[PDB]
Amino acid sequence: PTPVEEAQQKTIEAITKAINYMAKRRIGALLTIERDTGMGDYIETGIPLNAKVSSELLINIFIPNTPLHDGAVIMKNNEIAAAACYLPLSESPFISKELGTRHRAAVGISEVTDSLTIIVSEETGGVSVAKNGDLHRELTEEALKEMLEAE
Amino acid sequence: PTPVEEAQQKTIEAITKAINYMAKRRIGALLTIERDTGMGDYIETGIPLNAKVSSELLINIFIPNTPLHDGAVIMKNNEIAAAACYLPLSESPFISKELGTRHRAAVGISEVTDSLTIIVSEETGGVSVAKNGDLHRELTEEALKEMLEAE
């Protein structure tokens, strides 16, 4: 594999390890991966990080009662661009009624970009992904990893 | 002021805001600012960030009982280079005997570099600075700012 491909694999490994840990601990999380539609307008609403990705940094961002935990992390390739970002809220009727703002924000950004957003529920620990206006819930660890690899 | 001057002042303000937050909550912290002596060997022992400085990120790094909080943050060229870094423990017999390994690590790096290290005590929330092999204890906010500006 090329350096670009190896870097992508390392970033996938960092994301999945972080998400798997937050799911086990019921740590709510909202992580949007920019794709070909630029998300600068949303990145600029958060706290700039421009940080190398690591599982450790991803988890710490979302620890409850901390400055960075409310709002979305937006990643650009192999960097965490910003945290505590605003995303627009979807009004889609296909969002389970019991779900809160993180899931609605994820679907919302997925309606106006080609990004992939991962959500961890603080209520159940369930992991979901929003893409192209659809929310896919209750993902296994294997399914999430495959989704990211395909992305 | 010049761009460089404004950037230095912004970073000092971000540091002092984070230190004040951790002192109030008695969150142990260890933050070393690289100066003329290169610290790459110590940076390489931690988790790479190369992140923009913010008080928010500093606070979200230093969360008790997290891997990212286990060691020193090292700053270089107005960025957070890495977190959870190793620093050498001082063997000086002239450090206050009630202080533990955090303060000995700060003094230790200050014995072999021209860096400035800030320490927040998890026992008391007291703020200290290590430079040139000495520990300056029980600093006020004004005292810490003066040290950062002098540095």
Ligand SMILES: COc1cccc(C(=O)n2cccc2)c1
């Ligand atoms: C010690 O419990 C914690 C608490 C918060 C964050 C982490 C962490 O950074 N990781 C967990 C698995 C890989 C990375 C661990």
Ligand SMILES: [Mg+2]
């Ligand atoms: Mg299902």
